[PDB]
């Protein structure tokens, strides 16, 4: 069955997070690793794969390690030509290998026959709800037929950060928030968009949720971002 | 109280 929607008690409350929300913003504000037609060249632990991908941007790394949920998952893609898209981190990013290094989770998709013959992108609907009411709707784009939920999530939040201040340096306008994915077979699942309570935000522990390398069909998947303001 | 670890040194190259 599909994962049950959350009740208020199930969600993290930005009001219970004392840390710097900017550390969350950091992970989704024009921040991501992206590679096309590459193959793993190494692995640290059985459940991860390492790639030679360079920081086109600021030259901050040329080795990327992505961790997966289990060994089978890593074996599956270890020798395949693939594409990568995901949110990376540096704090507590470790691995030996055998330039800078960066880490992440999931974000892997087979490259063969997963693209559109024309540099044509696919639009995915994102409907935003604030206090249960649809406030704005839009679309993010992907160049993959079968895309990781992670890539879509990242693009959604990137947009919502600039257009709705989803996350600000220290804190957020919203108290709770979760992005929900709805697949064409009726299966749904969601991610809590807020940091766990306390004065620190473990970026690595948070990104681990992208572990499963969950992929969905870009031409039929539907996205819903559900936000709430503390008082209403 | 927090347990502290000794860091592993890199071997001579």
């Amino acid at each position: 069955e599909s994962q049950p929607d959350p009740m208020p008690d199930d969600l993290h409350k930005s009001s219970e997070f004392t840390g710097t929300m900017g550390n969350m913003k950091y992970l989704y504000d024009d921040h991501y690793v992206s590679a096309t037609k590459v193959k793993s060249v190494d692995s640290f632990f059985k459940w991860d794969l390492i790639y030679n991908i360079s920081d086109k941007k600021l030259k901050n790394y040329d080795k990327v390690k992505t961790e997966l949920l289990n060994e089978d998952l890593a074996k599956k893609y270890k020798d395949e030509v693939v594409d990568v898209y995901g949110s990376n981190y540096y704090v507590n990013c470790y691995f030996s290998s055998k330039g800078g290094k960066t880490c992440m989770y999931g974000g892997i998709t087979k490259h063969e026959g997963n693209h559109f013959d024309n540099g044509n992108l696919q639009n995915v609907l994102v409907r935003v709800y604030e206090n249960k009411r649809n406030t704005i709707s839009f679309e993010v784009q992907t160049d993959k037929k079968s895309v990781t939920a992670q890539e879509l999530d990242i693009k959604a939040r990137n947009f919502l950060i600039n257009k709705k201040n989803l996350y600000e340096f220290n804190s957020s306008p919203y108290e709770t928030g979760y992005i929900k994915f709805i697949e064409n077979n009726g299966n749904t699942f969601w991610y809590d968009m807020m940091p766990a309570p306390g004065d620190k935000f473990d970026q690595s522990k948070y990104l681990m949720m992208y572990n499963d390398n969950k992929t969905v069909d870009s031409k039929s998947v539907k996205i819903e971002v559900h936000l709430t303001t503390k008082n209403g | 109280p927090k347990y502290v670890k000794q860091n592993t040194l890199k071997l001579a190259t």
Binding site: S43, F44, F45, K46, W47, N92, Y94, F95, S96, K98, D202, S204, K205, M208 | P1, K2, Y3, K5, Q6, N7, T8, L9, K10, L11, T13
Partner: protein, 180 residues
């Protein structure tokens, strides 16, 4: 001497196995789950009195692997010599029929730290209730390990601790049955 606290860690190729743990007089205080990146205490209570930044262990593991590669290279790629384990099966306490007890399978003095252990109740595998420890260090640098099987003693039942290790030419089955 009175007490010894040991921080023991290792990395093994090509299984790419890694471990980081603390030892107090031979008994594990805790180890770090390399995947979930968190401290797992040997006894729930310890976690209420102390803490450890698990994430830090991973930094050590990275260095350990690189160091392994360096040593592997200067030894001219000398592989490790397999050393088969001694296996013993005992009870947690004097056995008594229908009185809850626990079978302990002692897997000692072996290397490298990779082993396949299985419990057998009358020729068949048992899963329910079983637990195990990670690899523990030894003065001679070999390893020890414990597997556990809670059980209800009976005259009928015959158990087996089935252990596989490269140093063994074949699976070793240590027989255990009620003899009191």
């Amino acid at each position: 001497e009175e007490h010894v606290i040991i921080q023991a860690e290792f990395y093994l190729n090509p299984d790419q196995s890694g471990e980081f743990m603390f030892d107090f007089d031979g008994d594990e205080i805790f180890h770090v789950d390399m995947a979930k990146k968190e401290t797992v205490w040997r006894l729930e209570e310890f976690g209420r009195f102390a803490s450890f930044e698990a994430q830090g262990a991973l930094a050590n593991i990275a260095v350990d692997k690189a160091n392994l590669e360096i040593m592997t290279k200067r030894s001219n790629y000398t592989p490790i010599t397999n050393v088969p384990p001694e296996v013993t099966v005992l009870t947690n306490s004097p056995v008594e029929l229908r009185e809850p007890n626990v079978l302990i399978c002692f897997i000692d003095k072996f290397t490298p730290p990779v082993v396949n252990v299985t419990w057998l109740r009358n020729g068949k595998p048992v899963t329910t209730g079983v637990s195990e420890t990670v690899f523990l260090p030894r003065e001679d640098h070999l390893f020890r390990k414990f597997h556990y099987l809670p059980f209800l003693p009976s005259t009928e039942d015959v158990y087996d601790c089935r252990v596989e290790h490269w140093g063994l030419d074949e699976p070793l089955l240590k027989h255990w049955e009620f003899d009191a």
